[PDB]
Amino acid sequence: PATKDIPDVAGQTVDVAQKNMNVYGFTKFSQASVDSPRPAGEVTGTNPPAGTTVPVDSVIELQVSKG
User: Fold this and answer.
1) Could you give the C-alpha distances from 66 to 27, 28, 40, 62, in angstroms and in order?
2) What CA–CA distance (Å, rounded) separates 60 from 67?
3) Which of 5, 20, 45, 52 shows the greatest Cβ crowding within 10 Å of its Cβ?
4) Computed over its alpha carbons, how large is the radius of gyration of the chain?
């Protein structure tokens, strides 16, 4: 369907990140925990990464800090 640029959601909680993803039409997410300096629970980034233009039916992986 339509394509859309993936928002930057670095630093957001998974709850918040998904709501902002939804605003762009993205609803399908996978998740993986990664070690990071960010507080546990915060998104460190996504795959595809922020700024990528993809179809809104794309699955977006949220990489999530576990500290």
Assistant:
1) 23, 22, 4, 12
2) 21
3) 45
4) 11
Q: Which of 1, 15, 19 is nearest to 43 (CA)?
A: 15
Residue 19, helix vs strand vs coil? helix
Q: How far apart are CA 27 and CA 21, in angstroms?
A: 7
DSSP state letter for 15: H
* The CATH fold of domain 1-67: Trypsin Inhibitor V; Chain A (3.30.10)
Whether residue 11 contacts residue 37, with contact meaning beta carbons closer than 8 Å, is answered with no
Are the C-beta atoms of residues 43 and 13 closer than 8 Å to each other?
A: yes
